[PDB]
Each structure stands twice: as structure tokens, then as C-alpha cells.
Amino acid sequence: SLILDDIILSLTKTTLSLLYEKSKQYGLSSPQLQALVRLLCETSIIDTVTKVYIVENCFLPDGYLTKELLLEIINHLGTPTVFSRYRIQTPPVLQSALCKWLVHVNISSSIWLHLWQFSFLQKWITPLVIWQATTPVDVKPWKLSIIKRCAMHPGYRDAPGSATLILQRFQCLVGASSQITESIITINCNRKTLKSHRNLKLDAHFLSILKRILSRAHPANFPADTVQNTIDMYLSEIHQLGADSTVSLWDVTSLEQLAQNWPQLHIPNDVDYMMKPRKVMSRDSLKHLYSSIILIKNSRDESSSPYEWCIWQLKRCFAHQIETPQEVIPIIISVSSMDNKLSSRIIQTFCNLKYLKLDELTLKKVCGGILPLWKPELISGTREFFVKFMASIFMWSTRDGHDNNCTFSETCFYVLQMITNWVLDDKLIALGLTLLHDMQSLLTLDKIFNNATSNRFSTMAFISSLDILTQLSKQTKSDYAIQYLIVGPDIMNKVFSSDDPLLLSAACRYLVATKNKLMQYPSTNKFVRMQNQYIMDLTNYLYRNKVLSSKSLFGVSPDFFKQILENLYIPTADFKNAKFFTITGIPALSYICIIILRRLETAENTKIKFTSGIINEETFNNFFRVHHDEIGQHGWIKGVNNIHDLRVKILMHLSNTANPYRDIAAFLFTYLKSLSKYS
Amino acid sequence: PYTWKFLGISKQLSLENGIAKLNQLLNLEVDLDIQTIRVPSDPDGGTAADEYIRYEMRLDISNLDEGTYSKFIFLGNSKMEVPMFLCYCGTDNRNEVVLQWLKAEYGVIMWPIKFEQKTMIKLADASIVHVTKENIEQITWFSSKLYFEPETQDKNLRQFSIEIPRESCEGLALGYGNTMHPYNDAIVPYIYNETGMAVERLPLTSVILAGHTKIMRESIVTSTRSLRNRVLAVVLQSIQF
Amino acid sequence: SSEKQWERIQQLEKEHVEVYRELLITLDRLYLIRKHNHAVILSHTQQRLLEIRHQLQINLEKTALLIRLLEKPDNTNVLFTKLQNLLEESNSLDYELLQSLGAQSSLHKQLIESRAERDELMSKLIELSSKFPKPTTAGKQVEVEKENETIQELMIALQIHSGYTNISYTI
Amino acid sequence: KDVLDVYIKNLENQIGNKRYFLKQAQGAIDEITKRSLDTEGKPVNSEVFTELLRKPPIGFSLTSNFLSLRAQSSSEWLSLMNDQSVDQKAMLLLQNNINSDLKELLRK
Amino acid sequence: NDITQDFLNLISISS
DNA sequence: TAAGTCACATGGTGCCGAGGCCGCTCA
DNA sequence: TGAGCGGCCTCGGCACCATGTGACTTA
């Protein structure tokens, strides 16, 4: 702000406090920082404790540090010598604190290295010369000679450990400049002083102050999270130190460079370095785009270097050759999620039983990274191959005897996402829909998806398939066949019999969508009466309580359904044949209706609570019998006098925007003339 | 005390051409040696496709220690899924320059090699069978020492070793019978029968042959100046997919 | 020791439901074979209805003695509290499933549009890269570059060590 | 804990009874398989399967096991799906950044 | 199609 | 001249007391 | 926020086997 440099020009007690508070509120600009350090260094009337308090509490940059600020600072870090006596000596504690503040925030590398020979600066120059050395060509034997000469020099304190840290960084960086580990051996072998040097503190209170100031500073220029990440990685680089006419692709540093020398660009065969992963532009600044640049410079074919690299590093992951099979798997996924030829090659060479046996976790990850984006090149033969692959993985999962193994279901969810991507395009939609029907056939087999050994993975895959069917049925512009929206009766009645409320909601959603599509179709076809059978069976099982009077329920005649009720003892025989065949009698929706009833009691602040833990006609009648005079006046849900009205009031609460059970309420409100007015 | 670091190679690279570029880059002539060895000469170890190609690259300047004697050994067979690995001793900084040149010239994918427990047992089996100029194989018996570093809770058992003397090892081998893999067939089953320890399951960090070599999980260090053909072959079958 | 009781009754109920399911399957196939002579080659459309009648018998029994225990709240038996614990952990996670599924489906749509954009970009850049033309003493040059490096480094050393008050990036 | 022990005894009694019924059923079906020399399966009559369709503490065990491992499987499905989803967010952030980079490279 | 559907029916029988 | 025995001098693994910083840690 | 115990851990001194090479002898 203008208050800061106004105080600065005034200084050319109250001004100090104003400068402190305006720095704590705004922070100085780079010319303001230049003027402040120029005023602070040149004069000596200001107290030294106030000088270090300023450099530790007042210098707060707002944006980029310009080169002129560094050049002005470097002018003040010098010492009086035999060729310069007119300038006064800057206090060494002020120089050390300024270098520490620099830690807090090819020529310049030599500038900082020649300042490293100062004894009092060595405790803070070392992170700067570590962070300056980012490339192998930066180091040189003259730098090594100077570092060793000053390290083994007597009269110093921090030189051995810190210079050993510098040499360790150089050894970790270049792998050249003939061996210098024996030079490290010549320097101290205590592993204690450089152990304390390798972790450095930056006064995290001041870091938080600068964090809040910089967050108050420019939008989309230094956000807080990236600043914290950059500071953390700069500290971790210190921490983990224990262990010409044509232009190469490495030396390209900016997007401007690629333009004028694209026909003069030489792509190197250094695939491992450029595929395996900073304010300075260097070779690693543009490492993201290298994989695409190779496939642009060399025309796409199944012989290019990134394709071979992905294939080899995936075979290494499958063969348990790599120590960490989670550092290159995201790289392979990011490269091969696009670029259809590589993904199709990976699918052809890896999606089978043989590589499933080797490692199913990495196969599951590559199926999550490749399958949802794949679009086939040859339509014929894809369906048979995918049926073979899904059958192989299903036998592999089911021979184990453990129903917890969810790899088949997870890969099924992935291939339903592939079917989503396929049916988003109007072409090859029949292949995707037939593959969806095959997946529905595999998901509903009673080896993983049972009524005793549950598997919510299979239910998630099934409701994903039903969601994709509902989203497919809303597309009028695509002239798909009518037979590809039914899944047969044998799946629908089975999943109606299943006790999963989300799955029943998805089934009701599928019925609602397919009827709204089938309304324009003729009223008497092979599948219209099939949908009519579906909705009449589901409505009879859900609301009507007329199962025994029907011809059949889910393909089963009600005589067997009654004979199961025979020899099935119930403690009270008031209403046995209609007690538990309703919305409150469904195994997945029994206690849900009780939760909804309790929430309705809580919302209306009713003094009466439904003490019985089951909603049926007998319990409803007994509940009105025990508290008749209280029910008659006030203290319960309004507008309800019978069990049917209670079910309607429950259905109102299930239609609210708070539950994942919208579709059952809409199904009952749609195909019931009594409930058609509640839509 | 020459530690050999092992790196696999994704391609069968031919070294008799293009090595003049390396000589020009390093400003020194290297002594590349070509050999065609047939390691599994035993009938039970295979009788066909046994030929390997052994390259011995050597940055020859002077011979006083490994500071000027960082050798490179390459082995290769074209009839394998992975066709080539290298191993290099010494600690010279020119070795990583050689590796960078090898990558940037041949376009190969290179990864470090880690040995499993059975791989280490097979390497200890391979490092005693010595080939003689009379074209015979000799088993030189060394007093082995299996050395473990288990990780247990509260650091209950930090480490434990199993020292096996030379005459006891040859007695176990003669008790089992005429075999050419003594450790995997006689020593390890005897240890399992006696102490109940399956050393192919336990975390095995090194097996030490006294006076000859001591192989580790990531490196092989040998008193002998070179590495014999059986060890190179067993490393080559180790990295197969 | 109560946790041991709950673990024990857990594997007992797992084996109980397993043996009852396979017992029902074996009983129904035994009825099929005993009514026939050797008819065991029944189609998928009949095995599925066998699975359907198994499933409805299972959930009908579950609801049937769900009627028996939850009709009168005793609030003293620990099996009762087991039922409320099981129900309250069953119905808790229902909304988050559909929320995560919808969010990841929107993510998949983002993948689809990003892939389409990158396919277009690669197509355009392959078309442009085929239109560019093909790609096409130094003894004193390296010496004068070495001289430049030595002179500039000596200049840096003389500017720093002499205390000269104007350090600048001199090319 | 006595009620838990006697209910454990009751359920293992029921388990043993069901194992007996399995053993007798499989012995009968194996005897009928032995007495039937026809290896090829006879086609099943629909009327016989129709007559089968007209004819017929267990459910507490069923609902307890079902709800318990159902909740466990849903919880672990959240864990794996959330890890996959945050991986997708990171990959999409990187992909959008490099998409903008390729768009700028195309323009230049 | 028909062979694939029969193969799925074989899976269902084998389940 | 190839192979063997020898003491010799250095390499090296294991061990442990001293002491220091760290690592939470709790009031 | 401030003292504070405990695992870590490295220094280094000691203890012992392990080891490579020259000197010397044998064939």
C-alpha cells in the first residue's frame, strides 16, 4: 500500500509500528522491498534488534521477486576489502537474518556460491545453492574444488556438515563429474551435524503470516495450497538428501520454443526419463507434454516409443517386477486412457484370464483406467471376446469360494461405463446394448448375488445398468430396436424378489422409463404385455395385498405362496395373510417405513409415538384402540384415519427431496388411479 | 569387495556396432569382449536354446582398484520375453554416463533388479559351480551363512542368522545325492526339516559364502574380479515375465 | 467375552444360511429327479425360476419371524437390540451410494468430453505435422565459448570478492 | 451369557439337522444316479416342474448375516469408489491442464 | 449371438 | 616357474556404554 | 505454552574373526 512507502520515505517509534501493522495487513511491493532494504542497510541509527525484527517481521513480499531486488540485496551482502573501504560494514547478524529471510522466500548460482565462502552466511546460503542446482550441467569440478576447499578449511563451524549436504545433493543430482563420495569421506563422518542441517525450520508463524498476506494478494497468482506445496517440496528436497542448429526435446523450456523449430526438432530415445516425473523453465518444466509430442512428431502406429513403454511397464507390474506398482500405473492410465490404438492393444494383450491370475489388483486398476474410455475399431468380434473375458473372470472369482472377492463386479461396473460411452454415440449402440444384456445375465446368477450371501457390489453394478437403461430410454432421436430394453422376465421377477431398497427403486425407475417410452408404441405387442405383467406383479406385491387372489406372482402361482404361509407360525393370527405383503411388509422396506413414520411424528411434534415396531393392519388397529380418545382429538399425524391413508402419507415423505427412494413413490403414484392425484 | 548393481534391459541391443560413438563421447577406448556361452550344460537343465551372448565392456584406463576398473557385464538371449540384462561393478561416475548413452542410443527401458528368496537361493547354487578349462564343472564348497532381518512387532526379533560350515554343507549334499543345486535341494530342505523354517518364505537379506561372495537382495558383491556364467544365467531367468 | 459370543454366532449364522440354501437346492433337485428318472438337464429359464422360488421363500421366512420378534417391543432381549443395530447400519449408507455413483458418472462424462477434445487435437496436430518440411568450423567455437565462460566467471569472482557495489547480470 | 450359549447350542443343533438332511438327500440322489445308466440328461417335462412350482430361527440367521455383510460390503465399496473417484479428479485436473496446453500449442 | 447366449446358459447351469 | 605354508598388517562385523536430539506428551 | 521421559542412534572403543599380499619354500 501507499502507507508502506510513505513511511519508508518518512524514514529517509510510531512509524515503526505503522510499518509493522501495514506489513501485517498488506505487505510491500518489490520496489518497496528494494527501498526498505536500501534504507535499512545503508544507515546505522536504527537499532540492530529492531533491524532483525524488521527482517523477520516486516519484509513480506506480495508477488514475484524481481531480479533487481536480488541484485540490490547482493550489493549489501558484501564485506569491506582492500579494494572497497568507503562502504560501511553491514552487520553480520543482519546479513545472516537477511539470508534466513531469503530462505523463507547460471550466473546467479556462481553468485551465491562465491558468497558461500563467508563463514557467518553458511548456515543459510546452503538451501539457496541446493535449490539453484536443478540440472546436471550446473555442477562442475571447479565448484566441487571450491566446496571441498572451503569445507575442509579450518576456522569454520557449519562448513563440514552443510558442505557435505551440498556434495550429497550434487551426487544425487548429476551422477557424473567423476566420483566425489570419497571427498564426502574426507569431510566429517559423524552423521549428526548434517543430520540437524538436513531438516530446517522456517519460523512457521512467519510462514502463516506470509500465507495470509499472499492469500490476501493476487487472485490466481500464488493460491495458498500451491504455495504450501512448493514450500513443502523445497523443504523435502533438503530432507530426502540421505538417499546446435537443431534443438533436442529436453532443452525446450517454453511453448514459444516449439513453434519456430518444430521442423528442426529432434525427439530422443530416452523414454524412461521423459515419462517418469518449479518456477524455473527447464527440461522437467514441460515433462507433461512429452508423451503426446512423441506421438505427434512420429505418426501414430503400434511401433512408437510411448506405446512400447506403457506395454513394458504394465508387463512389469503384472509380473511383480516393479517394487511400487502404483507410481507408473497412473502414468500408463493417463497415457492410454486416450489414444485408442494403445488402449485397444492393451485390451487385446492383457484383458484375459492369464494376466488376471498374475495380479488382479493391477488388472482392476487398468480396467478402471482403460475400459470406460475405449471405443472399438472393429465392431465384429468385440462382443464374443468380452463375453469370454467376463466368463473367465467370473469362473476365476467363483471357484475360490469367497464371495467377498469383488473383482468381477468392479470390472462389470467398468464395462457398463464403457457401454455408457458406447450408447452415447448413435453408432454401435446395438453391440453395447447386447453386451449390457449379457452383463445383466451374469450379474443375476445365484453364485454372487443371493438372498442369503449378499453382495452389494453386484447390486451397484445392476443399478448402474438400470440407470444407463433409463438414460437410454429417454433418447428419442435414436431408432434402436424395441427388444433391447427388456431383459426378460427371469431377471425382473428375481430382482423384484430381492430385498434391496435401492435396487427396487432402480427397478421402479426402469419400469417408469420403459412405460413412458412404450406409451407411443402399440398397446398390444410381445413386450407391452410383458411390462404390464411386471407392473401388475410389482403393484400387487407392494400395495394391493391381493396376492392370493391373483393368477400368479412373479411367475409363481399363489397356492405355493399360501402353502409357505402354512406351517409358518405367527404369534398373532388376527390378520395373517395380509400382514406383511405390502410397503411395510417388504423386507427391504419394513423398517424404512417405521423410520419415516417416526420422522413424521417428530416433524409434527406428536406426543404419541407408535410403540409397535411393525406397521401392519393389526398393529394399526391396536394402536388406535389403546389411545382412541387421544387419536380422536390431536397428537398424531393429521389427515390419516386408516392404514391406506398411513401408507399414502408415508409415500408423500418418500417423494420429498431427501431420500434415494424417489422412484418407488413415483411408481405407486403413476400406475394407480387412486394415487394418480398425488403426483 | 566389488559390488555388482543389476539392471535389466527391455531390448536385445547389439554392442559390436555403435561403440565407437561411446568411445568418442568418453574420449577413451573401451575393451569390449564378445563371448557365446552355453550355461545349462547339464542335461536336466536344458539341452536346447542354451546359448547366451556375453558382453564384457570395460572402461580400461589403469588397474589399481575399481576407481579405474568399473567393469560392465551384459548377458543376452533372443529366445526370451526379456532379452537382456546388465550388471556393473565399481563406483565410477562414468558408469551412469554409459547407462544414459545406452538409453539415449538404443531406446531401451532399464530398471533395477531385485532378487526374491528363491532367486537368492538359486544364485547361491549358481555361484559355486565353476567351469574349468578342461570343459568340466566343479562345485567349490564354501561355508555359507544365511542371514535374515525379520520385521516383528516391538522389534522383538531384529535379526537372526544360520551359519552352515563347509564340511557340513558337503555332507548334506552327499546325503541328498549327486545333485548340482546343493542349496535348493539339500541345505534348505534340511533347515526346514530341522528348525521348521521355510527360508524361501522368511525375509532373507543375504547369504554369505565365506571368502568368495555375499549376495544381497539388490546387489551382489564378490571377492573374485568377475562374475561367473551360472550367476549371470540365473539372474537372466530371474527377471523373466 | 461378549465379543467372542458375537463372533461365534456370526460364523454359526453364516454356515446356517449356507447349509439352508444348499439344502433347499438339493431338496428341490431331489424332487425333480424323483418325479422324473434322470431329467437333470433343465434349462436356464427353469433354474432361474427355481432360484426365484428360493429367494421368495428366503425373504418370506425373514419377514415371517421378523413379524414374530418386532411386533411387541420387549426392549430386554439382546437379539432385539441386535436387530436395531443391524437395521440402523443397513439403512445408513443408502444415500451415499447413489450420490457417489452420480458424481462418478458425471466424472465419466467429463472423461468422455476430454477424450473427444484430445482426439480432435491429435487429429489436427497430425495433419499439421505432416505439412512441415523435413529436418535438414566449430573447433574455435567451443574454445571461444570456454573463454567466454572463464571470463564471465572471473568477472563474477572479481565483482563479488572486491566489494564492488553494483552486481548485475552481465552477458 | 447363558442365553447366548443356549442359543448357540440351538443353532448348532439346527445346523447338524440340516447337515443330516443334506447327507440323506445326497445319498438318495447318488443312489438314483447309480441306478440310472442314462448319462445324457432327459428333457424336463414342464408339467412336472409346474407341480414342483405348486409345492414346497432360520430367518433371523438370514437377516442377521445378510444385513451385517451387506453393510460391510457397502462400506468397503465406498472406500474403493472414493479412492477411485479422487484419482479421477486428480487425473482430470492434470488432463484439463495438458488439454489447455495442447490447445495453445495448436493455435501457436 | 446364439452361441454366446448358449454359452451364458452354460455358465448359468455351471453356477 | 606353479603351487604351497607362513606370519603379517589391514579390513570388517558385532557389541556396548555414553550422550545427544527427538518425539511426542501431558499439565 | 513448557518441561520431560523414552526410543533412537551414532560416536567410538573394544573384541574377534576374516582377508589379501609379500616372503619364502617345494616341485
Tab-separated table of N, CA and C (backbone and C1' of nucleotides) in Angstrom, chain G residues 1 6 8-10 13 15 17 19 21 23 25-26:
chain	number	residue	atom	x	y	z
G	1	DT	P	1.634	-21.949	21.370
G	1	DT	O5'	2.362	-21.956	22.795
G	1	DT	C5'	2.725	-20.726	23.417
G	1	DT	C4'	3.093	-20.941	24.878
G	1	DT	C3'	4.419	-21.661	25.116
G	1	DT	O3'	5.074	-21.112	26.254
G	1	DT	C1'	2.655	-22.917	26.067
G	6	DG	P	10.489	-43.498	31.074
G	6	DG	O5'	10.727	-43.835	29.530
G	6	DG	C5'	9.617	-43.958	28.650
G	6	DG	C4'	10.076	-44.051	27.205
G	6	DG	C3'	11.192	-45.067	26.939
G	6	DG	O3'	10.912	-45.788	25.748
G	6	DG	C1'	11.829	-42.954	26.130
G	8	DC	P	13.177	-47.966	18.714
G	8	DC	O5'	14.157	-46.814	18.199
G	8	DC	C5'	13.611	-45.625	17.645
G	8	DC	C4'	14.697	-44.607	17.357
G	8	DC	C3'	15.951	-45.166	16.679
G	8	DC	O3'	16.284	-44.361	15.555
G	8	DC	C1'	16.541	-43.878	18.567
G	9	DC	P	17.171	-44.959	14.355
G	9	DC	O5'	18.361	-43.902	14.210
G	9	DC	C5'	18.542	-42.900	15.205
G	9	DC	C4'	20.012	-42.739	15.542
G	9	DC	C3'	20.927	-43.810	14.947
G	9	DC	O3'	22.133	-43.217	14.507
G	9	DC	C1'	21.216	-43.738	17.265
G	10	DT	P	22.636	-43.423	12.997
G	10	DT	O5'	23.938	-42.503	12.913
G	10	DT	C5'	23.967	-41.261	13.603
G	10	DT	C4'	25.085	-41.237	14.630
G	10	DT	C3'	26.345	-42.025	14.242
G	10	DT	O3'	27.494	-41.272	14.573
G	10	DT	C1'	25.635	-42.666	16.365
G	13	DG	P	37.994	-43.640	20.483
G	13	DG	O5'	38.430	-44.605	21.680
G	13	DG	C5'	37.530	-44.842	22.758
G	13	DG	C4'	37.260	-46.327	22.929
G	13	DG	C3'	38.436	-47.248	22.589
G	13	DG	O3'	38.945	-47.838	23.780
G	13	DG	C1'	36.340	-48.099	21.795
G	15	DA	P	39.373	-55.445	24.712
G	15	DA	O5'	38.603	-56.478	23.767
G	15	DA	C5'	37.255	-56.828	24.053
G	15	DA	C4'	36.737	-57.840	23.048
G	15	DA	C3'	37.772	-58.864	22.579
G	15	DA	O3'	37.220	-60.173	22.615
G	15	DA	C1'	36.778	-57.797	20.718
G	17	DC	P	38.451	-65.643	17.404
G	17	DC	O5'	37.889	-65.520	15.913
G	17	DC	C5'	36.496	-65.677	15.674
G	17	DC	C4'	36.097	-65.073	14.339
G	17	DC	C3'	36.690	-65.763	13.109
G	17	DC	O3'	35.683	-65.926	12.118
G	17	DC	C1'	37.176	-63.461	13.046
G	19	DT	P	36.600	-63.911	4.621
G	19	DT	O5'	37.908	-63.058	4.290
G	19	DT	C5'	37.900	-61.653	4.481
G	19	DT	C4'	39.158	-61.026	3.915
G	19	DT	C3'	39.830	-61.829	2.801
G	19	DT	O3'	40.194	-60.962	1.752
G	19	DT	C1'	41.395	-61.306	4.467
G	21	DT	P	45.514	-58.794	-3.107
G	21	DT	O5'	46.967	-58.844	-2.448
G	21	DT	C5'	47.422	-57.743	-1.675
G	21	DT	C4'	48.806	-58.003	-1.114
G	21	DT	C3'	49.808	-58.610	-2.102
G	21	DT	O3'	51.030	-57.892	-2.040
G	21	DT	C1'	49.765	-59.862	-0.107
G	23	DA	P	58.603	-58.868	-0.723
G	23	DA	O5'	58.867	-60.158	0.184
G	23	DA	C5'	58.843	-60.041	1.603
G	23	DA	C4'	59.101	-61.384	2.263
G	23	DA	C3'	60.287	-62.168	1.693
G	23	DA	O3'	61.092	-62.674	2.751
G	23	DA	C1'	58.357	-63.519	1.715
G	25	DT	P	63.507	-70.033	2.659
G	25	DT	O5'	62.610	-71.251	2.137
G	25	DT	C5'	61.709	-71.893	3.031
G	25	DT	C4'	60.768	-72.823	2.285
G	25	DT	C3'	61.447	-73.965	1.519
G	25	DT	O3'	60.986	-75.218	2.012
G	25	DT	C1'	59.775	-72.901	0.201
G	26	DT	P	61.650	-76.588	1.499
G	26	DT	O5'	60.659	-77.083	0.346
G	26	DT	C5'	59.302	-77.370	0.657
G	26	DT	C4'	58.536	-77.791	-0.585
G	26	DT	C3'	59.235	-78.842	-1.454
G	26	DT	O3'	58.320	-79.876	-1.796
G	26	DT	C1'	58.582	-77.002	-2.772
